Symmetry: C3
Subunit: 40 residues, 3 copies
């Protein structure tokens, strides 16, 4: 039970990191594409 609540909490946290970071990566990628486009 402690194992299982802590495992659930661990997955909840990782899901939240995953989404936050994919979004950051996505925004970073759009900025890099816009700068490349500018310099074209």
């Amino acid at each position: 039970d402690k194992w299982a609540s802590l495992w659930n909490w661990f997955n909840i946290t990782n899901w939240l990191w995953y989404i936050k970071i994919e979004e950051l990566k996505s925004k970073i990628k759009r900025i890099e594409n816009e700068i490349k486009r500018i310099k074209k």
Copy 2:
């Protein structure tokens, strides 16, 4: 105790990571705000 200690270690690590990621996200937000201003 061993479960409580793991919970604590995980929460402390997660908080410190949280602070650091919000700082990246702000740098991104500022760059976005600035590109938007340039394209105006």
Copy 3:
């Protein structure tokens, strides 16, 4: 019980490491962007 404890401890350090590598790459990319923006503005 201990074995589960160890699994969760190992999963937390492996995932924490994988995120570390990931975020370091991102901090690099942001720095490159900021420096490029300062260069253009100078």
